[PDB]
Amino acid sequence: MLKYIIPTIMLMPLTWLSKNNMIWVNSTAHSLLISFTSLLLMNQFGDNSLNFSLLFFSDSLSTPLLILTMWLLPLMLMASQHHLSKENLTRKKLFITMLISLQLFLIMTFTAMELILFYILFEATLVPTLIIITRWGNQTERLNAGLYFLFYTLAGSLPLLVALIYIQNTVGSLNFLMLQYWVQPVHNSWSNVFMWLACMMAFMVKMPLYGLHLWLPKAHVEAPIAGSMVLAAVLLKLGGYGMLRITLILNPMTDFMAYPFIMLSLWGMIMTSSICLRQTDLKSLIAYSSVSHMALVIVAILIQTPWSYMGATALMIAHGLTSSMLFCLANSNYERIHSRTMILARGLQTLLPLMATWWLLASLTNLALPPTINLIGELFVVMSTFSWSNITIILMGVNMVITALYSLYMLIMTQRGKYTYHINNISPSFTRENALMSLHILPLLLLTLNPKIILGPLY
Amino acid sequence: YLTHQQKVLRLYKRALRHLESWCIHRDKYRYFACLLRARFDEHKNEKDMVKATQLLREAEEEFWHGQHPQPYIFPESPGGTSYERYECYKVPEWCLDDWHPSEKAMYPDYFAKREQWKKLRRESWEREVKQLQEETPVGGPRTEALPPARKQGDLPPLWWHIVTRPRERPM
């Protein structure tokens, strides 16, 4: 993975040694090249994963997440140019350095072959994320958002550190390839009940699991646009990715420990989807939609079936491009009216005709219109949960109805109707804004032509 | 609020409109329109206000019991089929300031004349503010009605958004 780690590190000298007026151009161009070379990870086999060395390996699960992660860095740089224009040059270059550090930690996180190495990198993503929220957020609440995002993750991650170190002392290794062959069943005892909680609580808080999600509406809303994009597109998927790996060494105890979390997620789906029906803040409505979409991922991972795993991987990638697109669309309005209230600016389809087309496509993907990969992932998770218990179709069905109501309510409330009379600074959409949306939705739809590359190892 | 005179006239208009819906045919409506007019005539010049209110209050109950469940509504009136049908074509005038010069080059006369209006609005604003800063009572306005122009050459205060408003059939 040194062919990707080293070029990412070299994005830092490039930013710092570039001309003052070329920092965005240089960093954007070379981050798109690193994204281009990420396609070489697609050299996957039907039996064995890519095992590069003693430290890093890539399989069909980490590869789509790696490609998504490296694709978002250029998009984050585009989305941040406007609101950082009136910023000190050194502080503009420190903002980019935090984004590059976040990618550096993420690419090493998804390919780490040893669980403790995964833990350190999984935990190191907090520092740059915390700094982006608290330093370059706009409102007062960014300080409290950072504290919630920080202490929710460490309250669950620290017990995971003890559990991992305990596993190495008893099994002898934490290399993920070794665990595939040396794994042993988990006898049902009170000691193993808490090894299960310690091995899964960190990932569920980061998903997030309903009830432990209170950090997400704060952090995802108060962060700058680049922070929100990475927060919702790649950093929620560290929890899902971890559970996919860690669940290998928790059988059979997962078949009864999963009930309290399958119940929280299934019922959390309906609660979080319902909250969106009454959200006054547009950016907050999008934040709660992630909680409802990651509820399906938790359920799929916990019921442990080939179809649920295939759906989970497609959902994480599909949700990554859609939620990220929605935040950029919402930030497009904010940069004109400088308010997050959804009902402030209305009828925007009569003033920004083309940006209303992106709203439509971003809304259709969010409500899982077939055959988008959003529907493929969601459908695969409904099929698997039906076999688990036929009654689940009721809860899955109700969430689909609510999802369409708050997806189109957002579209109707902000785009249709009469325009607000006293808002007269709605300038025509920039080429930067339009190209930012096209870089979200076009890959999201092209994947429908070749879905297999995002269906995960179980394919 | 509405004075007793205004409430009676409104009920008469509503009574005839709903009655027109029941009758449909013009000749039949022209018959019951006269009979309903007579009922408004037997008490045309009532003197006791308390009695007049009891007559008006009882007419409403008869109106509510007799109103058409699906009254006729003009196409462009609130609740009508064509209501707000063209609000999507109604763009404000300030959107023209964001046009590219190439688009403005297609309408050199329109934008030359639009510049004159912008100058007229810009020159008369400071006078319009004063015209309202002096006629307003000490506390603040007690009604929503604006005063006209008092000096020759002045424009009615707060005129731009009622004069430049989009047409009813913009496209």
């Binding site: 009569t350 003033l351 920004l352 005709p353 025509p428 959409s429 920039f430 080429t431 | 763009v91 404000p92 005038e93 959107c95 023209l96 964001d98 046009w99 590219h100 190439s102 688009e103 309408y107 329109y110 989009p166 047409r167 913009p170 496209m171």
Partner: peptide
């Protein structure tokens, strides 16, 4: 009578 149609900028 060939009036002017006010529409938002379509150039961009």
């Amino acid at each position: 009578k060939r009036l002017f149609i006010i529409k938002p900028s379509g150039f961009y």
